[PDB]
Amino acid sequence: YDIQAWKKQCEELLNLIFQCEDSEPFRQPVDLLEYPDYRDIIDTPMDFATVRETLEAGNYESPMELCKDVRLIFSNSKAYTPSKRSRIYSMSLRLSAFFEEHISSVLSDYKSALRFHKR
């Protein structure tokens, strides 16, 4: 019932995501010189360094907010991909499955802790 425990759990999950080779295309903002039409398709860029920095700044109130930004990394890859078989998109799908598998307990524990606080 620890309402604050999510933050360190998210830090540890981001550390695992940065060790995963599948995260390399997503660790820093998409390079606009490499992909010059990126912002014609993607309204809200997001990357794992921005997520980590937002967490470390104390600018997430809940793990739901962090989860929304990570999911945006993956939806941006899906929107920008020219093919559902492309390398970078393919990496995004594996990383998404790994993230969802690990975040589910973080979210459940947080929401249970808040319900207990409010009982």
Curated annotation (Swiss-Prot):
It comes from Homo sapiens. It is found in: Nucleus. Probable regulator of the insulin and insulin-like growth factor signaling pathways. Stimulates cell proliferation through regulation of cyclin transcription and has an anti-apoptotic activity through AKT1 phosphorylation and activation. Plays a role in the regulation of cell morphology and cytoskeletal organization. It is linked to Chung-Jansen syndrome: An autosomal dominant disorder characterized by developmental delay, intellectual disability, autistic features, anxiety, hypotonia, obesity, and dysmorphic features. This is PH-interacting protein. Residues 1-106 form the Bromo domain. Disulfide bonds: none annotated. The modification Phosphothreonine is found at T44. Interacts with IRS1 and IRS2. Interacts (via bromo domain) with acetylated lysine residues on histone H1.4, histone H3 and H4 (in vitro). The chain holds residues 1316 to 1434 of 1821 of the full protein. The modification Phosphoserine is found at S90. It comes from the Eukaryota.
